Design a binder for these strands. Sequence first.
RNA 1: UUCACAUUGCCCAAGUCU
RNA 2: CAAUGUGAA
Length: 787
Amino acid sequence: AFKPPPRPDFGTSGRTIKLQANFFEMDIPKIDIYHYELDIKPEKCPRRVNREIVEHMVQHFKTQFGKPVFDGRKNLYTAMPLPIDKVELEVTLPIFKVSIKWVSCVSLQALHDALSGRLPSVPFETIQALDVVMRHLPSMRYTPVGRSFFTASEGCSNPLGGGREVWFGFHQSVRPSLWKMMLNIDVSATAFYKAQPVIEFVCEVLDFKSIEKPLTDSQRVKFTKEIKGLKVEIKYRVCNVTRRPASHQTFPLCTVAQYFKDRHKLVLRYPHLPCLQVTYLPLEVCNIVAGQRCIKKLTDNQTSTMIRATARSAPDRQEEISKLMRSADFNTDPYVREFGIMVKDEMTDVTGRVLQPPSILYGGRNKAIATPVQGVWDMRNKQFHTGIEIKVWAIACFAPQRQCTEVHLKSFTEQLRKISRDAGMPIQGQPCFCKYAQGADSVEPMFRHLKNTYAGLQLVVVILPGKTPVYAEVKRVGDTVLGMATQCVQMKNVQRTTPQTLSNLCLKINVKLGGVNNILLPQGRPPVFQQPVIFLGADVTHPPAGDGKKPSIAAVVGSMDAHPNRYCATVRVQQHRQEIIQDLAAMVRELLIQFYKSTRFKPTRIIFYRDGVSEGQFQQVLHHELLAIREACIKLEKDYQPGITFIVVQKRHHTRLFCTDKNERVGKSGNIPAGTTVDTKITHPTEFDFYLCSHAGIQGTSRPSHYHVLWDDNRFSSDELQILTYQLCHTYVRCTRSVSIPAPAYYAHLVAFRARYHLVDKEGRDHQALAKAVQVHQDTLRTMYFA
RNA sequence: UUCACAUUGCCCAAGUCU
RNA sequence: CAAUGUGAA
Ligand SMILES: N[C@@H](Cc1c[nH]c2ccccc12)C(=O)O
Ligand SMILES: N[C@@H](Cc1c[nH]c2ccccc12)C(=O)O
Ligand SMILES: N[C@@H](Cc1c[nH]c2ccccc12)C(=O)O
Ligand SMILES: [Mg+2]
Ligand SMILES: [Mg+2]
Ligand SMILES: [Mg+2]
């Protein structure tokens, strides 16, 4: 329950495809490098201040440092050793003591062996050392954000308004591979505050043209909410905006305007404006400090502008990474060549395989088979594998009568019954109930009435005028209070129906009512399906940036048949920003019990797809969650020990894959085709991992999902696990498309997001309250309410 | 709240000194 | 899932 298994073999399925990856080969010298520890007092100074201190120090004590790199905290590295036995030094800032002592030697050669087959595991300390080398210069030249670097783009202004603009940048990371050390580079963009005078900032915030008396309370509060917490220089952080203008704002030995008239001989041009409190500064003498990322949520218009800047087709992104690398010229970096490192300026060539899609089996009389082409099929001339007969249903229209008329509802109804009959999900008649209502208050009594009145009620269709709190209320009552199936539809999709939208709607409705839309062609499935097997999907979703006390939400779903198609869900609230699923053992236990009730089999194998865990968390997560899965098995039955396969799925990494031949580019966005698999060259030197781009990239540059096997009792071959994973991407019921992650992992997301809706404005006694809020009704417990 | 893909928001990372 | 885009039988 600890060390990840070795790669068993390499995959062989699928035709080959030439690819380019945004990985750049590194040539590392075979020398010892030297690690030193650095203590600085005081030790709360920002990482950038620490970097500053060291670099002025290094160029000070040259002849006592005969080009060291620094990680901004405690670690310093040199290519050739120092004369230095601990030493304590003295430096001066634009009054620091720096402790510099030798701790160890880092051999890059040892890393060379780990990249070879000689060493089983890559020595992390070597990788970190290389990362610090590659990060030293851009950490002082640019503005660091995570593993990325941002700067104002020379020659261009990309304003967002409101005092904000777009900074362009890039992600940078160092990683081992089957081939060589690789520099992973991707381009990015993010919102920064303009380094403008506060006066101009005021005008952009308050939508002023020039500069238009003292400020309205509404003007003062808006400007206060925009600048509070930001840094300004004439270096201060703004904590408040005064209520009084500089004319009258007073401080004990006496106004602000008079102090500046007297001491600095400065007569304020706009004394009618309030002061920033940081002790008060007039707006006129203050600039917004450059390089402050905008943490706050962007406006709708700012988002739109941002999208129209970070939106690039695959070839466009490919070209921009390449142009960045050729302009970056990593090989002229003084610290890089100091350590004898050479970075290749061209993308690494990789050979991928394009896996064949499974056939999708439908039902009805014809029992049609659909063949995915480039990640997409459709349901024309096809019926559900198991279609639901809808006898008793109701409509609740919360949209206004004037806009969503009885004629609209009638026309929507007839169109839906037509599409649903074609799909093999016959809606046998008119609804038994159809009424208008308004506001969240009407939801609960209306649904109780429906439940008490109409025996065998199967569904409530709910018409919503658009974004409204009524939706959350409908799901609260439907999912957790009364246990009733609901399907919501936006008014505009009732007013104007299309075959495609109605058809997609029927996919969800059939599923919600217990139907089977389609199944993988049974004979086309990998050998693992010969024995009872349960597929688990797990995810944790964390609160937005800046949030302080909202819980994280853990969701786990499990397959309930052999197709696999039907899933049951479990969900939990847990500690703020904790990734480890705390109550997993209980969740899996529930799923195993439900599996046995549905199939009358005990799983001989458990396949666990775990979404969103980064490399630095692998061992911690695996340790708790693998043991949790075992615990669930143990407490169920004596010596019940099914084989566990633990797979981490990452969609949000920085690996991009491009077609080498423009002949292979698919569609407008020019992405790699669905099914493209990579398990050589750029993947892990010893462990079992692969990229699988399972979906059609219709938009921008596709994110190829990465799969990392942390544990495998079942000893999968590369081929079977890759094919299995790909096939599970075709089992997602909400669309006739191969999706970007396997359906169980995707369902886990939907469950987590539904719980978040159950918690809107509700997030010991605290925990029990929130836990109760996400607990679904007994009747809902065994349904796909999350669809 | 028809749906997928894409950008960001999510663990690690990053960030915090008159 | 929220904001914003591009798309679909
Ligand atoms: N029903 C199958 C058993 C089976 C195979 N694979 C499964 C996966 C899940 C559940 C059951 C199964 C049989 O007896 O032939
Ligand atoms: N404990 C289950 C039955 C069961 C025993 N061993 C199992 C292994 C897997 C799934 C279910 C089981 C019950 O209460 O009915
Ligand atoms: N099969 C493993 C142990 C194991 C796998 N799955 C389990 C589930 C529960 C308990 C133990 C296990 C072994 O060789 O020992
Ligand atoms: Mg997650
Ligand atoms: Mg942390
Ligand atoms: Mg959206």
